[PDB]
Design a protein around this ligand. Structure first.
Ligand SMILES: [Ca+2]
Ligand SMILES: [Cl-]
Ligand SMILES: [Cl-]
Ligand SMILES: [Cl-]
Ligand SMILES: [Cl-]
Ligand SMILES: [Cl-]
Ligand SMILES: [Cl-]
Length: 245
């Protein structure tokens, strides 16, 4: 296998009911059960996260997340969503799906609720953001101003398992979904020129406001990609290069 166990969360969770080294720190509203990590309960005004206990120095990787978002809210009344992170800092709660704003690195947002009254998107909506510390995620507008790419995605209250994959290698960032019980990865996002350093932390977070949902992480499995390279990679500033019009 090219599984990197130390950057993964897999049942039975390491160090849970044992003297073993835990591989994750659990923060905020997060609660830990034998069959899932629940970042937030279906309760209002919650912020919870899980952060890999050590930084990841892989240059080429692919993270598979088995998650579940589910709740009893009537009509459209649920929120806020989950964020997956590969960032400089860790463990700090905030308004960005339970984690700090003005972050450094990569976010993948699984946004369940249209905060934006004049949105032109259909929700839930998965998108990516790359940040150098300067940008704020505008939650009130579902991050309209800072979205690199995204896709609509039906992932709440499904009768079968839902998964997400995030692959990063040689500047190419690909997000794929498996939401329709097809045992297939469907493309959501595929962009190039994404610059990220090594030495950042994997984490996941969720938040709730006046609207809520259960936001569960079942597993996160990080794979090392065997990719050739021919620079101090820890000093790369998070950024994106853009093909000219
Ligand atoms: Ca939203
Ligand atoms: Cl684990
Ligand atoms: Cl509540
Ligand atoms: Cl924004
Ligand atoms: Cl929905
Ligand atoms: Cl379904
Ligand atoms: Cl899908």
């Amino acid at each position: 296998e090219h599984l990197k166990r130390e950057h993964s969360l897999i049942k039975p969770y390491q160090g849970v009911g044992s003297s073993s080294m835990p591989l994750w720190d659990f923060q905020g509203s997060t609660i830990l059960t034998s069959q899932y990590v629940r970042l937030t309960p279906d309760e209002r005004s919650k912020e919870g996260s899980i952060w890999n206990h050590q930084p990841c120095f892989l240059k080429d990787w692919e993270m598979h997340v088995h998650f579940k978002v589910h709740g009893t809210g009537k009509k459209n009344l649920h929120g806020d969503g989950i964020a997956l992170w590969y960032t400089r800092d860790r463990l700090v709660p905030g308004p960005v799906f339970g984690s700090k704003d003005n972050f450094h690195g990569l976010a993948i947002f699984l946004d369940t609720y249209p905060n934006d009254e004049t949105t032109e998107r259909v929700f839930p909506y998965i998108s990516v953001m790359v940040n150098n510390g300067s940008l704020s995620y505008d939650h009130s507008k579902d991050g309209r101003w800072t979205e690199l790419a995204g896709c609509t995605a039906d992932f709440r209250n499904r009768d079968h398992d839902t998964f997400l994959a995030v692959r990063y290698s040689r500047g190419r960032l690909t997000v794929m979904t498996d939401l329709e019980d097809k045992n297939e990865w469907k493309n959501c996002i595929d962009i190039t020129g994404v610059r990220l350093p090594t030495g950042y932390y994997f984490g996941a977070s969720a938040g709730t406001g006046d609207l809520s949902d259960n936001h569960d992480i079942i597993s996160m499995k990080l794979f090392q990609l065997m990719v050739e390279h021919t620079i101090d990679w820890t000093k790369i500033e998070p950024s994106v290069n853009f093909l000219k019009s």
